[PDB]
Design a protein around this ligand. Structure first.
Ligand code: ET
Ligand code: ET
Ligand code: K
Ligand code: K
Lengths: 140, 140
């Protein structure tokens, strides 16, 4: 409808999506930082990740990353295994519970997006995302 | 672009609009409640508003409204004048500084909206607002 400002519609949609996601998030009890770490591992552990690599990629310091990985390992969401190429070296990866956790978190957003996408045709979705991007561009 | 989720675009646009509005808002130093009161007065003072009317419309109690109007009157943003129809009665309205303040606040959003609207054609804007409303509908 034309009775609403873009500000209102965007505020409400964003608020609602946030509320749903948050209500879904309160049962993980894991840190934002740790969530980002687990997601990075989900996306890149096939590269054989070391602590330093995680530090660089996360743009955090070594001891902070150490703290995170220590806490995640305590929770049994990650583990360290001997490198297949070089048995001298160790790599960090997800455990089963970690993979499950990342997939759940991600499924929340994938389902939300799919819900939104299914309301419009492919062309309508394409036009919508393009106009949204133009608008945001107009906001910077 | 299709590389972004609706969640991202809506979060960013809403965040940005919020940041701009807030940065514009920090120089009024007046309450949210008082802002709403002043806006209601801007929209309806021609009806000859009484304290009770404001209470009903704002869905607040009498003494709370009294507190608000007391503070607004202290700041010289509102005033009480004798009713033209019934000199027995008094009405609440904006002063000059109040009208100016409401117009400034409102101009922030009108300008923001106009900025957003000018990026798209009228048909594009109409389609966009309609799809946004459908989507929000899909979120409730
Ligand atoms: C970095 C995004 N992010 C956030 C997050 C951090 C800050 C603000 C907003 C959301 C997050 C927040 C909570 N509570 C739980 C899990 C995650 C998470 C999990 C995985 C991932 N790949 C990114 C994640
Ligand atoms: C009621 C909207 N609202 C809010 C507001 C309140 C709560 C949350 C968000 C914005 C507001 C917040 C500040 N700081 C200053 C002025 C106003 C305002 C002013 C006029 C109006 N007609 C509505 C107004
Ligand atoms: K790895
Ligand atoms: K009045």
């Amino acid at each position: 409808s034309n009775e609403f400002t873009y500000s209102y519609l965007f505020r409400m949609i964003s608020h609602e999506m946030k509320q749903k996601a948050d209500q879904k998030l309160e049962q993980f009890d894991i840190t934002n930082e740790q969530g980002h770490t687990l997601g990075y591992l989900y996306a890149h552990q096939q590269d054989g990740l070391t602590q330093n690599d995680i530090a660089k990629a996360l743009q955090r310091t070594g001891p902070t990353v150490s703290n995170l990985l220590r806490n995640l390992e305590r929770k049994k969401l990650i583990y360290r295994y001997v490198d297949a190429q070089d048995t001298r070296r160790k790599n960090i990866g997800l455990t089963t519970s970690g993979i499950k956790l990342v997939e759940a978190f991600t499924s929340i957003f994938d389902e939300m997006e799919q819900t939104l996408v299914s309301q419009l045709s492919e062309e309508e979705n394409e036009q919508m995302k393009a106009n949204l991007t133009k608008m945001l561009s107009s906001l910077q």
